[PDB]
């Protein structure tokens, strides 16, 4: 029965972001938006890039997305937008000129320089005069760790998002059978940043259909060394996951405590025991690295 795994693999640092993670509005070979006039009567052509936050939407009643505004491949403005999850209206924007401080968002504009020149969000398609404000970002069908994920893709290849890289982790269960756990990852929009999911085979868990175990944002140093794993392993130390026994029922909580989301639980049919597994991504000889070389699994150690 597997209790500890060591992942030895490299993720190529120059791996380009997938369109499903960072979506440029419009057709290939032409700017997203043309002849956008700023408050100083100057016209621009802009690229508009919506990016997934890597954090499950909705957040406090809103669908949140990252936004970059680019001119000739240079970011002139950036921030986060939040659309009402029910009504699809823009609710808040932190889009401001790049490097701005303090960040000063607007429901109708963004600054494009420190001098305070602005453009209209509507001319960028971030707001919609003839429909739902979120129409153009919704068209991008962006990654979501909860509703449009790599685990969704594993279950149905027409759904969710295909990973940039995967590490398969074979577990021996309490019966000696082999359960495959997979670490699925996407290059994130941030520097040295990746979106990650841990997942069992779809159907191997009783508590969902796609087999997702956990999700998290993984960060690397500028030198390609693992920096942190976000909430991928929760707050465990050492980093670990626990998959509950077949037939495990979480007791009803006593109400200062709140009922935790149903934890990963082995399918009834498997009839196997709780499996707590340390997952070591930072060993001295190996570990999960992010150098500019081929994405590759060097080896996976198990006990």
UniProtKB/Swiss-Prot annotation:
The keyword Repeat does not apply. The keyword DNA damage does not apply. Belongs to the flagella basal body rod proteins family. Keywords: Bacterial flagellum. This is Flagellar hook protein FlgE. It comes from Caulobacter vibrioides (strain ATCC 19089 / CIP 103742 / CB 15) (Caulobacter crescentus). GO terms for cellular component: bacterial-type flagellum basal body; bacterial-type flagellum hook; cytosol. It is found in: Bacterial flagellum basal body. One of its GO terms (biological process) is bacterial-type flagellum-dependent swarming motility.
């Amino acid at each position: 029965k597997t209790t500890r795994v060591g992942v030895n693999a490299n993720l190529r640092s120059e791996q380009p972001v997938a369109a499903a993670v960072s979506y440029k509005v419009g057709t290939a070979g032409s700017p997203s938006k043309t002849n956008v006039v700023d408050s100083a009567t100057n016209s621009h052509n802009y690229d508009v890039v919506y990016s997934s936050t890597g954090i499950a939407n909705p957040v406090s009643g809103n669908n949140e997305y990252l936004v970059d505004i680019k001119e000739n491949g240079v970011i002139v403005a950036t921030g986060k937008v939040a659309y009402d999850a029910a009504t699809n209206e823009l609710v808040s924007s932190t889009i401001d000129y790049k490097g701005a401080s303090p960040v000063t968002g607007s429901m109708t504009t963004t600054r494009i320089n420190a001098a305070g020149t602005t453009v209209n969000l509507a001319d960028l398609g971030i707001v919609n005069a003839s429909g739902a404000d979120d129409a153009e970002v919704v068209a991008g069908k962006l990654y979501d760790p909860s509703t449009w994920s790599m685990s969704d893709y594993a279950k149905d290849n027409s759904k969710g998002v295909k990973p940039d890289f995967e590490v398969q982790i074979p577990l021996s269960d309490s019966k000696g059978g082999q359960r495959t756990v997979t670490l699925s990852m996407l290059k994130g929009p941030g520097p040295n940043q990746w979106y990650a999911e841990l997942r069992a085979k779809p159907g191997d868990l009783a508590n969902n259909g796609n087999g997702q175990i956990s999700t998290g944002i993984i960060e690397f140093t500028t030198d390609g060394k693992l920096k942190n794993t976000g909430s991928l392993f929760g707050t465990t130390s050492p980093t670990a996951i626990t998959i509950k026994s077949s037939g495990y029922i979480a007791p009803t909580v006593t109400p200062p405590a709140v009922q935790p989301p149903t934890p990963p639980t082995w399918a009834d049919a498997l009839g196997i025991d709780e499996q707590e597994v340390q997952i070591d991504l930072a060993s001295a000889a190996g570990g999960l690295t992010q150098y500019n070389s081929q994405s590759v699994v060097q080896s996976v150690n198990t006990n």
